[PDB]
Design a protein around this ligand. Structure first.
Ligand SMILES: Nc1ncnc2c1ncn2[C@@H]1O[C@H](COP(=O)(O)OP(=O)(O)O)[C@@H](O)[C@H]1O
Ligand SMILES: Nc1ncnc2c1ncn2[C@@H]1O[C@H](COP(=O)(O)OP(=O)(O)O)[C@@H](O)[C@H]1O
Lengths: 435, 201, 106, 82, 403, 32
């Protein structure tokens, strides 16, 4: 299911090799200076040299601030994490605002952790070659080595493992004919189950028979797991393993999202650095796109302009849509963009001008193309004219309903009559203001 | 390196056969069936051109099926002219009726293998002839027959140009062959120099 | 240049010779021989029940309707046994250079 | 123990010098077909060497492979003069 | 895939008759189960055992002279004994695929066909050349079958499965020459002695010292030809055991420095030949300074091959040089194939591919003719070429046009 | 110039004596 979203045509900033801006910029049109600033900041992000830097996508409504935000996000690629957040999500009834902001900052930061493990598997043929008793002591019966005949699909390879592991072999039901999961360093044996070759159709049992391993006995499984710092925080927050945690009444209330700074910073950062400099993981700072930043309370901005001061804070892309308005939580304290004047000094303002009527027509045409419906020249011109009259977002919403009206009327392309009828069936707020 | 090409066999290789192991595993697999009786029955191949009959191992279910390989006996298309046809059309001075008949018999027997024909050609009953000469004669006769009955122009001169030149080449003495190779290398050097010149311009 | 000239021609078609590389019967490699027929080609293949590459091989029908699988020897016959890691998905790039990953599946 | 390991390795080596594999698993390989995909993702069928098939018509023109040792084919264009 | 066009196996008792050893066996098999000496102990006793028991006369005679059967009585006796003892199969029960040399006369061929279709009444028959089978044994339709039998060396070329009769070169160089030279060398350095046929028991002898042994008091065996054959047996044993072919022009500087090799005669006499053990296999390739015939004019192996190639049309030589087929007993000698390859390479004109079929590892070269015969018989399409009893009884009995 | 010209001349002069030449000038085979 394609499930076309509101604005999915944006695929990237579409900047030329020289870094300038063009019209057909991979879905997004116009906004030359804004897209160039987006390119500069995405180059910054890719550099991964600076932290705690914020940028403000100030601009009137309809300038496609969220559009260019998703464009730069896609340009960054799925490699680096991108956590979208709206100012309303900060208001939580169970966890304070600043801690939600810190959790979002952590989510915005990524971390790839590699893990290589040398493991041996295959059908076992246990046999202990009798050896003279310990030569340092007396005589008797001892075992200096324990040979395990691991048989894999590719062949057979006997391993003369250490004799001390014999306890593990006897611990689990390791009988001749089952698949075992050996570990190089640890040596612990974990039986996977009997081989399917012995799973007679008349034997009723499940989870006990497994297929033979494909490949050499010695396998060096390399696996990479990308988890944000917030994932590690949550994992180390709650407990696991016994301790009467199975209770329902006094424990089912899992929403204990409350978090402290000691655990968040400190030990977690240190272990992350140890994994980084040791070669076990690679840090991947992402981006935190915060739209409707003006909706945050002053208690949120006062914590933002302090968290951005930290060396670990990721890149934040604020997108304020309102203009000069009183800061929330303050007594008639008017500030530009609804953001305190102190935080605006820490953010780079990327201004976005209004779309030219030609840009409106281009946007309408590319949205119609993405939708997959053909529109005649006259219909497209009428759509552009009405998008110039009222908000541009009204025109793009008139494509699908006009398309369905055309399809039901027996015609394929959206004729001017269809859009004309839809404009009278549906209209915008500017016309609805006539109460 | 690259994949190998060999007709029969290499030095150390070995080929796997079919499986007949795990009788216990396949006990009931093959125990629920039987074997179709095979009989040392006599078979008559229609391509024998006579009444002889031999034996062969076949199942009793297809006592018929005269012979599978019988359809491989495809005789070459060799015209069969009469005496009057030779007297009227194929008459020649150097050649004679008996010689042309012998040539056609050898051709029909060896399947137009002019080399083997010349090899087995009776140089005693008829003076020595060359391969290209036999080919020219045969193709001329075939063309004349196809025309009178109502394929491509044969040029003995070409064979007269190919075989002696190729023989003289095969007989290249060691010293003169090395000199020819040196001249070839010198011509290659001249070509490389010309390439360098045209590139520098 | 001399009596041996190609000036002669008639209503027929002439076969052209190949120079600088004398060819051989169809059972020779095109790289070294000429017109190498694929029928005599030994290529890397992987068996069905086993999970090991037996090396270069070619399918052939034998007496009694039974089909055989000849094999060949090259590159020590050991690098191909490890090549299974390249077909299932230095001694690592060599498996990719000696061949074009044209190993027979199933 | 070192000598025992050496002799065991030698014995195992001797075992590997007789024959690696000797069967083909006719259960599936006998009837199943073989296919591969090159670096370019192109498909090709495995040609199995079968005996000469019965010719149903005058096709399969005589090739005279032994002559191809020095000749390859006949181009269309020629000198086109006496 | 039922494989209906695989092949057919209908009797076809291949009988590859040879001057040193006759071979026989059923078609379809890979190795002939019958291999015994060809010479009969004519007083007829023809067997590896019967030909080694002392009796009144037991004169040894080979029916095939120059590879051509001449004594039809001895040939018929050999065939009957072979059948009855080794095969135990009724004559008129299975066809026969006997082989012949490329130089078989028409009259002799007709006489052989008559003997096959009259006294044995075999259901069918087919007489193919030895070079053709030797070529089929190697799956080659074109090539130079360098036969090196015990009485002739011939580089017979074949074209599309047909032997080029005009290209054959019957060089006298063969096993008999090597055996005569070895006998002469022995007589020069020591006294050639009979195998254990007469030696009762041997004793320990110091290397180079005269040997001592006990003589048997059995029959005298006045027939010297039989003694000559018993001596040729040990001569051939020596040839196949220690005699080695040189690898170069055989200068008298390297042979004196090569390792030494030993050999024990039937009586225990131990002697070393590391100095001149490679002098005898020289006339085979360089018959210019042989002590036997110093004023002779012969062609070596490479010379014979080059002549056989040149005497044929040039259009096939590319397929002859590139598919040289070495065969026969003399070839099994050490360094023979390598010397032949070197000589042909240095002699053959460059730019022409020269490839020696790798078949010297095994001793199957001798049996190459029988292998090719069995292969040809096992074919299905060939099942129509057999000369049936009807074609003979009809009155034609003409194997020339049918073969 | 001073030597390459003489080399080219002696090569062209010794190129083809009477037609026989291994690199080229090979009579084409006839079809059958
Ligand atoms: N340059 C452009 N090209 C194509 N479509 C655009 C462009 N700018 C805006 N749009 C359209 O505008 C709509 C919403 O824009 P948005 O990013 O929400 O701006 P705002 O958040 O200020 O309203 C989207 O559905 C998108 O299709
Ligand atoms: N007339 C013949 N035609 C074909 N092959 C022959 C003929 N005479 C002898 N041979 C072959 O030549 C061989 C001669 O044996 P010989 O060379 O003395 O054995 P070795 O040298 O291996 O000890 C025999 O094995 C025989 O098969």
């Amino acid at each position: 299911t394609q499930r076309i979203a509101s604005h999915s045509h944006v695929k990237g900033l579409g900047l030329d090799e020289s870094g300038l801006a063009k019209q057909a910029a991979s879905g997004l049109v116009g906004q030359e200076n804004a897209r160039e600033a987006c390119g500069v900041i995405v180059e910054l992000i890719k550099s991964k040299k600076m932290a705690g830097r914020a940028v403000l996508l100030a601009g009137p409504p309809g300038t496609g601030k969220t559009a260019l935000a998703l464009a730069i996000a896609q340009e960054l690629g799925s490699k680096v994490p991108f956590c979208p957040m709206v100012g309303s999500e900060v208001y939580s009834t169970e966890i304070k605002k600043t801690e939600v902001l810190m959790e979002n900052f952590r989510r915005a930061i990524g971390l790839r952790i590699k893990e290589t493990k040398e493991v041996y598997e295959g059908e076992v043929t246990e046999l202990t070659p009798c050896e003279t008793e310990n030569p340092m002591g007396g005589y008797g019966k001892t075992i200096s080595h324990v040979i395990i005949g691991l048989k894999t699909a590719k062949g057979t390879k006997q391993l003369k493992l250490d004799p001390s592991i014999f306890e593990s072999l006897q611990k689990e039901r390791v009988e001749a004919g089952d698949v075992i999961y050996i570990e190089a360093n640890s040596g612990a044996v974990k039986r996977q189950g009997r081989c399917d070759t012995y799973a007679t159709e008349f034997d009723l049992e499940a989870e006990e028979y497994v297929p033979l391993p494909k490949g050499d006995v010695h396998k060096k499984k390399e696996i990479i797991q990308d988890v944000t710092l917030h994932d590690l925080d949550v994992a180390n927050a709650r407990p696991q393993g016994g301790q009467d945690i199975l209770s329902m009444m006094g424990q089912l209330m899992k929403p204990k999202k409350t978090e402290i700074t000691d655990k968040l910073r400190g030990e977690i950062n240190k272990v992350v650095n140890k994994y980084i400099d040791q070669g076990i993981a690679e840090l991947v700072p992402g981006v935190l796109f915060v739209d409707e930043v003006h909706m945050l309370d002053i208690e949120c901005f006062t914590y933002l302009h302090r968290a951005l001061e930290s060396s670990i804070a990721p890149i934040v892309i604020f997108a304020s849509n309102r203009g000069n308005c009183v800061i929330r939580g303050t007594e008639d304290i008017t500030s530009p963009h609804g953001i305190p004047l102190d935080l605006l000094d820490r953010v780079m303002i990327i201004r976005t001008m209004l779309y030219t009527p030609q840009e409106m027509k281009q946007i309408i045409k590319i949205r119609a193309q993405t939708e997959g419906i053909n529109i005649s020249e006259e219909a497209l011109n009428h759509l552009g004219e009405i998008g110039t009259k009222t908000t541009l977002r009204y025109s793009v919403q008139l494509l699908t309903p006009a398309n369905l009206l055309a399809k039901i009327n027996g015609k394929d392309s959206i004729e001017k009559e269809h859009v004309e009828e839809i404009s009278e069936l549906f209209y915008d707020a500017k016309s609805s203001a006539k109460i | 390196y690259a994949l190998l090409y060999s007709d029969k066999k290499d030095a150390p290789p070995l080929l796997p056969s079919d499986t007949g192991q795990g009788y216990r595993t396949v006990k009931a697999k093959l125990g629920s069936k039987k074997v179709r009786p095979w009989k040392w029955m006599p078979f008559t191949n229609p391509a024998r051109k006579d009444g002889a009959m031999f034996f062969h191992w076949r199942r009793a279910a297809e006592e018929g099926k005269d012979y599978p390989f019988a359809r491989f006996n495809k005789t070459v298309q060799v015209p069969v002219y009469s005496e009057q046809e030779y007297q009227l059309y194929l008459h020649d001075d150097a050649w004679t009726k008996a010689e042309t008949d012998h040539l056609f018999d050898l051709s029909r027997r060896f399947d137009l293998r002019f080399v083997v024909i010349h090899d087995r050609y009776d140089h005693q009953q008829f003076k020595k002839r060359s391969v290209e000469d036999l080919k020219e004669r045969y193709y001329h006769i075939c063309a004349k027959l196809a025309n009178v009955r109502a394929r491509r122009k044969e040029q003995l001169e070409r064979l007269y140009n190919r075989t002696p030149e190729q023989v003289a080449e095969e007989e290249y003495l060691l010293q003169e062959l090395r000199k020819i190779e040196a001249r070839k290398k010198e011509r290659e050097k001249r070509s490389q120099d010309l390439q360098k010149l045209i590139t520098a311009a | 240049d001399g009596p041996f000239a190609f000036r002669r021609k008639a209503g027929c078609q002439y076969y052209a010779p190949h120079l600088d590389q004398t060819g051989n019967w169809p059972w020779t490699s095109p790289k070294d021989g000429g017109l190498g027929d694929v029928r005599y080609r030994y290529c890397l293949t992987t068996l069905t029940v086993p999970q090991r590459c037996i090396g270069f091989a070619r399918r052939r029908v034998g007496r009694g309707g039974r089909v055989l699988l000849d094999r060949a020897h090259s590159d020590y016959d050991s690098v191909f046994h490890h090549l299974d890691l390249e077909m299932l998905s230095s001694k690592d790039l060599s498996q990719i250079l000696v061949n074009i990953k044209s190993c027979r599946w199933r | 123990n070192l000598k025992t390991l050496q002799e065991r390795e030698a014995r195992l080596r001797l075992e590997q010098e007789e024959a690696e594999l000797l069967t083909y698993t006719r259960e599936d390989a006998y009837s199943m077909e073989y296919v591969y995909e090159d670096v370019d993702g192109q498909t090709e069928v495995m040609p199995l060497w079968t005996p000469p098939t019965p010719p149903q018509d005058d096709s399969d023109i005589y090739l005279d492979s032994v002559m191809c040792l020095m000749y390859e084919a006949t181009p269309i264009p020629e000198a086109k003069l006496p | 895939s039922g494989g209906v066009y695989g092949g057919d196996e209908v009797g076809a008792l291949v009988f590859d008759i040879g001057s040193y050893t006759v071979r026989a066996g059923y078609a379809g098999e890979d190795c002939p189960k019958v291999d015994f000496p060809t010479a009969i102990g004519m007083v007829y006793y023809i067997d590896t055992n019967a030909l080694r028991v002392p009796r009144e006369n037991m004169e040894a005679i080979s029916p095939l002279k120059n590879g051509m059967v001449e004594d039809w009585d001895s040939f018929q006796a050999i065939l009957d004994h072979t059948y009855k003892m080794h095969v135990k199969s009724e004559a008129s029960l299975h066809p026969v695929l006997m082989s012949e040399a490329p130089w078989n006369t028409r009259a002799k061929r007709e006489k052989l066909t008559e003997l096959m279709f009259e006294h044995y009444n075999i259901p069918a028959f087919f007489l193919c050349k030895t070079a053709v089978l030797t070529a089929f044994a190697n799956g080659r339709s074109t090539g130079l079958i360098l036969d090196s039998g015990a009485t002739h060396t011939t580089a017979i070329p074949v074209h599309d499965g047909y032997v080029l009769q005009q290209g054959i070169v019957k060089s006298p160089l063969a096993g008999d020459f090597i055996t005569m030279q070895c006998r002469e060398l022995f007589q020069e350095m020591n006294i050639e002695l009979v195998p254990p046929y007469m030696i009762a028991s041997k004793e320990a002898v110091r290397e180079g010292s005269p040997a001592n042994w006990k003589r048997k008091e059995k029959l005298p065996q006045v027939t010297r030809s039989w003694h000559n054959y018993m001596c040729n047996c040990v001569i051939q044993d020596f040839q196949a055991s220690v005699l080695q072919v040189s690898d170069s022009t055989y200068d008298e500087q390297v042979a004196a420095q090569m390792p030494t090799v030993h050999y024990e005669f039937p009586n225990g006499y131990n002697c070393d030949f590391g100095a001149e053990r490679l002098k005898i296999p020289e006339g085979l390739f360089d018959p210019s300074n042989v002590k036997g015939l110093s004023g002779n004019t012969m062609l070596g192996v490479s010379h014979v091959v080059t002549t056989s190639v040149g005497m044929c049309d040039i259009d096939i030589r590319p397929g002859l040089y590139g598919s040289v087929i070495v065969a026969g007993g003399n070839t099994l000698i050490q360094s023979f194939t390598d010397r032949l390859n070197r000589e042909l390479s240095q002699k053959t004109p460059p730019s022409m591919r020269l490839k020696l079929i790798a078949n010297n590892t095994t001793v199957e070269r001798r049996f190459s003719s029988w292998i090719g015969g069995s292969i040809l018989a096992s074919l299905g399409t060939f099942q129509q070429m057999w000369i049936s009893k009807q074609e003979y009884e009809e009155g034609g009995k003409q194997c020339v046009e049918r073969k | 110039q001073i030597t390459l010209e003489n080399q080219v001349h002696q090569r062209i002069a010794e190129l083809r004596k009477a037609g026989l030449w291994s690199q080229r000038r090979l009579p084409k085979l006839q079809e059958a």
